[PDB]
Write a protein that binds this ligand. Structure first.
Ligand SMILES: [Mg+2]
Ligand SMILES: [Mg+2]
Ligand SMILES: [Mg+2]
Ligand SMILES: [Mg+2]
Ligand SMILES: [Mg+2]
Ligand SMILES: [Mg+2]
Ligand SMILES: [Mg+2]
Ligand SMILES: [Mg+2]
Ligand SMILES: [Mg+2]
Ligand SMILES: [Mg+2]
Ligand SMILES: [Mg+2]
Ligand SMILES: [Mg+2]
Ligand SMILES: [Mg+2]
Ligand SMILES: [Mg+2]
Ligand SMILES: [Mg+2]
Ligand SMILES: [Mg+2]
Ligand SMILES: [Mg+2]
Ligand SMILES: [Mg+2]
Ligand SMILES: [Mg+2]
Ligand SMILES: [Mg+2]
Ligand SMILES: [Mg+2]
Ligand SMILES: [Mg+2]
Ligand SMILES: [Mg+2]
Ligand SMILES: [Mg+2]
Ligand SMILES: [Mg+2]
Ligand SMILES: [Mg+2]
Ligand SMILES: [Mg+2]
Ligand SMILES: [Mg+2]
Ligand SMILES: [Mg+2]
Ligand SMILES: [Mg+2]
Ligand SMILES: [Mg+2]
Ligand SMILES: [Mg+2]
Ligand SMILES: [Mg+2]
Ligand SMILES: [Mg+2]
Ligand SMILES: [Mg+2]
Ligand SMILES: [Mg+2]
Ligand SMILES: [Mg+2]
Ligand SMILES: [Mg+2]
Ligand SMILES: [Mg+2]
Ligand SMILES: [Mg+2]
Ligand SMILES: [Mg+2]
Ligand SMILES: [Mg+2]
Ligand SMILES: [Mg+2]
Ligand SMILES: [Mg+2]
Ligand SMILES: [Mg+2]
Ligand SMILES: [Mg+2]
Ligand SMILES: [Mg+2]
Ligand SMILES: [Mg+2]
Ligand SMILES: [Mg+2]
Ligand SMILES: [Mg+2]
Ligand SMILES: [Mg+2]
Ligand SMILES: [Mg+2]
Ligand SMILES: [Mg+2]
Ligand SMILES: [Mg+2]
Ligand SMILES: [Mg+2]
Ligand SMILES: [Mg+2]
Ligand SMILES: [Mg+2]
Ligand SMILES: [Mg+2]
Ligand SMILES: [Mg+2]
Ligand SMILES: [Mg+2]
Ligand SMILES: [Mg+2]
Ligand SMILES: [Mg+2]
Lengths: 8, 114, 118, 209, 123, 56
RNA sequence: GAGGACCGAACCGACUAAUGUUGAAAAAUUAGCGGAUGACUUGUGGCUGGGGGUGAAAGGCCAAUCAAACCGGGAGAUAG
RNA sequence: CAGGUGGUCAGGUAGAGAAUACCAAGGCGCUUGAGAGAACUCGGGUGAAGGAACUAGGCAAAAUGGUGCCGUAACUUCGG
RNA sequence: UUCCUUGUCGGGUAAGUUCCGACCUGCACGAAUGGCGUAAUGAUGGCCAGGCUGUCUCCACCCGAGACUCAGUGAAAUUG
RNA sequence: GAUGUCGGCUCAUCACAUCCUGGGGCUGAAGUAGGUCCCAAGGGUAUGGCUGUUCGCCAUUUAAAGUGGUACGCGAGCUGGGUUUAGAACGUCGUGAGACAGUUCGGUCCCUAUCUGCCGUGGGCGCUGGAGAACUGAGGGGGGCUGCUCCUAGUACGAGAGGACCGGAGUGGACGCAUCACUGGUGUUCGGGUUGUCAUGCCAAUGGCACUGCCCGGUAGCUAAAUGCGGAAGAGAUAAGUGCUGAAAGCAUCUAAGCACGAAACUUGCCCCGAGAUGAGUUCUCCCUGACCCUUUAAGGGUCCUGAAGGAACGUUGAAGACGACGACGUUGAUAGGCCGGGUGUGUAAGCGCAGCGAUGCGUUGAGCUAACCGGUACUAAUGAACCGUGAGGCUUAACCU
């Protein structure tokens, strides 16, 4: 999973 | 439904003349301007006929003052006083809806002659 | 909704339905009894019995209307030479449906459909 | 006031003399035979029970046939009750015909509405559809949200959802009576009444003004 | 059956040629204007020396529709296009002096008797 | 979506409490063979309501 | 009868949308899309090796593995 | 396993054509069926009056589309 | 590239934080890590109009494949 | 060892600190129209331009365009414009790698529902012999909006301008239910035209395929844009408020005793559901009236004979329907198919013949064909049976009859 796409 | 056709067969007009699509027909209708009562004429080409007994109708198209006007008449309605054919036309169809996109000399209809 | 509608779709489109009932009506005219499913046999009466009504008056135009609906000259010949004179004094009801068991491969309810004087 | 049991024959049109067409529904009201009278001593309320039509004698059960033979009337297709007012009296065996409505001006008609089967929320509750384009993923006639988050954490009762539509008892009120034809057992009311052609209708005088 | 963004023809000699309906008046969430109804319009096309100019915000009454009118016997009168007559914003009186084409008998009211008198034909 | 707890063998038998099959009660006897068959169906030996309908 | 010319099939690509997303498929189908005589495209063989290659440059690609491939050893690294 | 894989052969009617439609020689109906004719999803057809008012955005859909001839503006590196 | 800022003025619209033209107060442009123009090109970013339409007002009906029922075979994630 | 997130869309629900509609007091309230406070939550409470915007400014309406809560409601319901990892550029900061609530173009949105819940629809058993019907109605839900024009009347009030209260009539907007008679949409199951090609030996006539090949009309059903109906009046008890009589307090005082008014809120009146209302109700009708054996003795068990009223199953099916269910019918029959007559639609078939060089035209001929429609007709299928369901229905008291 490419978790860094989640906008923080 | 013998019941409904008995109720409808006693309301139908008995002197409706013969016409077909393509004919030029003058229709005289009752108008009431206030409380006196007159007849007015609508003369044009029959473009559609619906046949349902008491629910019969026909559509008349005419050009009025440079404007296209269509009128659906209920045939057995007592507003319509008389129907009269002025000219018999020769067409191949039952519905002349293609006359809506034609104007002037493109809208001529041949007389049947036979 | 479905109110007052006629005809069975039978999980086909319309041109497959028409080709299937032309073949089935030709096989019933040929062999005079076939085995099919029960809904196909019920939908076949509204196909086969008008052809037998059409064959009760012989004319060139009725042969051509039967050829247009069957596309087989052997079927039109048997309709107009044999089946017409058989049923000449019968007002409808030319076939008869007999229910039979279930098809082994899919549990389909099967039925025979025959002609009445077979 | 009591009413009558009829049958929907269908719709037609009546032309009037000034050239106005009136849409009418034709209701056949044959004579209603009173089969039982109820009162406050035995039943706790005042009412009559009527029947109409006919039935195959092999389709009438023995309890129904004994109930019709005790009254002395012929067996109809069903049984309906009407609450009596104070000062109205009838006797068992009396026939009531459509000339009861000869001076009635407006009526209420009750029938069983037409069955639509399982209906979605667009048809059943006039819900708005979502976008036909612009990215919509498989959600064109779906109902949308059905509640709120953790508070309350449930769906409320009476939430408008898909389900059985139609096929239920409906009353239309205050319909103009156009014509009462006693010779052919007819009653003509203006407008449309619930149900399909051939269904049973209950025609009462109007409760309002 | 006129709603917003509908283009209408102009049936008088006020100077305008094309108008656009920008409000159907007389009620909240009101959808349509048939024959006889006042609408608010803006002028899209005009003749070079008319009474009105392009971009004016005026009132108008609908006199002809393609959807048509209905008669108490069930009859229908349809037309080939949609037309309106321009009115003053406050007096709601006609701007032009002639009327072109036929009109119907739904305009027969105290508000629009100058239209009824000026019309070449009333159907 | 999936269960959060394992359903019991009791809830499984309660769900399967409508799964039982219906035996045919109606076996008719044909009036010339005397053999059983379904109602409104032909027999195994090709009779129906007293007559030989298929000679097979 | 020139052209990194033009329209357009094969052939090579991958811009949009729907679908699928325990897929028919660990990157696809459908309908539209770009190039299509050239800095084109492709079969057969060969050469370049891991702090190394190759890169019309994206830290891209080097056997579904890449800001240092894989396999075996040091090795039971070390882990407040 | 709706994906991938180089070369060779190239009929008829229409067509500029190895495009497309229908056919020949040749080969196939793609290894679950049978019913019914609900919501809702997928792929399509048609739509009164209106006509981008939808939306972040004319996304998607609709539309245009061939041959011959007449005719064609600003601008320009004189080719367009 | 401009924070203040939707700067101010003109145009286009009934109504324009976007666009186009212009001003100059350039927080914080500028000359080969180029300045400023520029025909032709672009599955490039933005904006306006005509055609066209189920995008929409406001959805209706139809045709197919599923969903439903009968027979056969028969998964999965999760689970104190 | 993961509680997805700004705005919109769909769908809401609640509060009341009320935007409109209803009722009142004061006004520096002449009337119209305002201000301000008190009561009141039944219903209702814009469309567009700009922008990702929520807001805001603006255009034009409306009776009015309410303020908040609900994970700043709602992504296992949708979008993905804002924000937005990896690409790239600008301004700027740093020698630099790089950095920036500075900007800009681009940038993968998974889940077949076990449980609670909600919407619908069935099976079981209970309701005390069984069965078939019609009800009463504890309780529950739906619904409740409003403009304008006219008469009272150019009356009240006002210098004039202007312009009412109360009350009555009509006609609209939004919303809801029903229906298909009318106007229309659809109508791949009816008719016709037509391009290409293939076939039926050939001419003629037809059929397959090309999105139903492209089209033009259209039956029934379904339907809205079509056309009928609706919100009530009335009654009870009240909110704020206004009062009658009346003392404590010789007066006064709406209140403490007694008495009356008083609103879209409340309870009813309108519509629907409703006896699993386990408190399981009522009324009407219908069927069943044989003999033995044993045990541990009681609402006992077993045996042969009996099988009702009614039901279910099977079949033909439906304006009923996902499946169940519900409705009509099964030869004492119109239930479906077919057939017969009518209708409706399309629009003058084929064959033959005559005119023409020919394509074509004309006569036969408003012809032929015609789905779901209407009225008829036992020609086809709806079977003689079998199956479930029993054999008078507990105990105690009370009142009448014997
Ligand atoms: Mg039927
Ligand atoms: Mg299937
Ligand atoms: Mg139904
Ligand atoms: Mg979709
Ligand atoms: Mg847990
Ligand atoms: Mg099961
Ligand atoms: Mg080139
Ligand atoms: Mg090219
Ligand atoms: Mg692609
Ligand atoms: Mg493709
Ligand atoms: Mg291409
Ligand atoms: Mg980099
Ligand atoms: Mg490298
Ligand atoms: Mg790789
Ligand atoms: Mg290292
Ligand atoms: Mg270790
Ligand atoms: Mg070591
Ligand atoms: Mg394969
Ligand atoms: Mg290849
Ligand atoms: Mg090809
Ligand atoms: Mg397969
Ligand atoms: Mg379907
Ligand atoms: Mg389309
Ligand atoms: Mg349309
Ligand atoms: Mg249109
Ligand atoms: Mg817009
Ligand atoms: Mg909008
Ligand atoms: Mg596009
Ligand atoms: Mg400006
Ligand atoms: Mg500028
Ligand atoms: Mg620079
Ligand atoms: Mg320099
Ligand atoms: Mg320099
Ligand atoms: Mg330079
Ligand atoms: Mg450009
Ligand atoms: Mg714009
Ligand atoms: Mg299933
Ligand atoms: Mg199975
Ligand atoms: Mg956890
Ligand atoms: Mg308050
Ligand atoms: Mg006040
Ligand atoms: Mg915008
Ligand atoms: Mg939220
Ligand atoms: Mg959620
Ligand atoms: Mg974004
Ligand atoms: Mg996007
Ligand atoms: Mg952005
Ligand atoms: Mg999603
Ligand atoms: Mg997706
Ligand atoms: Mg739970
Ligand atoms: Mg209530
Ligand atoms: Mg009709
Ligand atoms: Mg029509
Ligand atoms: Mg059609
Ligand atoms: Mg052909
Ligand atoms: Mg020929
Ligand atoms: Mg073929
Ligand atoms: Mg085809
Ligand atoms: Mg083919
Ligand atoms: Mg009831
Ligand atoms: Mg009970
Ligand atoms: Mg008879």
């Amino acid at each position: 999973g490419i978790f860094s796409i989640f906008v923080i | 439904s013998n019941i409904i056709k008995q109720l409808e067969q006693e309301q139908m007009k008995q002197d409706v003349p013969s016409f077909r699509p393509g004919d030029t027909v003058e229709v005289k209708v009752w108008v009431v301007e206030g409380s006196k009562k007159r007849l007015q004429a609508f003369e044009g080409v029959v473009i559609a006929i619906r046949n349902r007994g008491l629910h019969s109708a026909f559509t008349v198209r005419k050009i009025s003052n440079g404007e296209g006007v269509e009128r659906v008449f209920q045939t057995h309605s007592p507003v319509v006083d008389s129907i009269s054919v002025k000219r018999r036309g020769a067409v191949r169809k039952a519905k002349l809806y293609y006359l809506r996109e034609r104007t002037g000399k493109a809208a001529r209809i041949k007389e049947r002659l036979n | 909704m479905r109110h007052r509608k006629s005809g069975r779709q039978l999980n086909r489109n319309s041109s497959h339905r028409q080709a299937m009932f032309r073949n089935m009506a030709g096989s019933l005219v040929r062999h005079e009894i076939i085995k099919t499913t029960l809904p196909k046999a019920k939908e076949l009466r509204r196909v086969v019995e008008p052809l037998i009504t059409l064959a009760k008056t012989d004319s060139v135009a009725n042969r051509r209307l039967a050829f247009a609906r069957t596309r087989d000259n052997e079927i039109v010949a048997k309709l107009f030479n044999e089946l017409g004179p058989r049923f000449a004094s019968r007002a409808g009801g030319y076939t008869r449906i007999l229910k039979c068991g279930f098809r082994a491969g899919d549990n389909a309810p099967m039925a025979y459909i025959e002609l009445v004087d077979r | 006031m009591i009413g009558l049991v009829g049958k929907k024959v269908g719709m037609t049109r009546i032309f009037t003399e000034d050239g106005v067409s009136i849409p009418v529904t034709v209701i056949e009201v044959e004579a209603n035979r009173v089969t039982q009278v109820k009162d406050l001593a035995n039943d706790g309320y005042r009412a009559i029970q009527v029947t109409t039509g006919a039935k195959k004698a092999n389709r009438v059960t023995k309890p129904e046939a004994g109930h019709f033979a005790k009254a002395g009337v012929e067996a109809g297709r069903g049984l309906w009750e009407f609450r009596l007012a104070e000062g109205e009296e009838f006797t068992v065996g009396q026939s009531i015909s459509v000339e009861l409505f000869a001076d009635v001006k407006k009526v209420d008609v009750t029938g069983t509405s037409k069955g639509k089967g399982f209906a979605g929320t667009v048809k059943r509750w006039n819900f708005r559809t979502q976008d036909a384009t612009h990215g919509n993923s498989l959600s064109h006639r779906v109902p949308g949200s059905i509640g709120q988050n953790q508070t309350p954490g449930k769906v409320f009762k009476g939430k408008k959802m898909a389900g059985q539509m139609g096929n239920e008892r409906v009353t239309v009120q205050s319909l103009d009576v156009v014509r009462v034809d006693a010779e052919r057992n007819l009653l003509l009311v203006k407008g449309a009444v619930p149900g399909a052609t051939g269904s049973d209708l209950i025609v009462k005088p109007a409760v309002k003004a | 059956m006129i709603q917003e963004q509908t283009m209408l023809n102009v049936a008088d000699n006020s100077g305008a040629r094309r108008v656009m309906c920008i409000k159907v008046l007389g009620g909240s969430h009101r959808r349509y204007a048939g024959v006889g109804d006042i609408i608010k319009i803006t002028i899209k096309e005009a003749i070079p020396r008319g009474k009105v100019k392009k971009g004016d915000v005026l009132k108008a009454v609908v006199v002809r529709t393609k959807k048509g009118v209905r008669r108490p016997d069930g009859s229908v009168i349809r037309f080939d296009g949609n037309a309106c007559v321009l009115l003053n914003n406050n007096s709601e009186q006609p701007i032009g002096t002639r009327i072109f084409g036929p009109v119907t008998r739904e305009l027969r009211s105290e508000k629009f008797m100058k239209i009824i008198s000026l019309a070449p034909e009333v159907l | 979506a999936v269960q959060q707890n394992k359903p019991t063998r009791s809830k499984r038998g309660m769900r399967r409490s409508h799964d039982a099959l219906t035996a045919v009660t109606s076996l008719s006897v044909d009036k010339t063979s005397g053999e059983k068959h379904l109602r409104h169906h032909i027999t195994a030996d090709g009779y129906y309501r007293g007559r030989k309908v298929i000679a097979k």
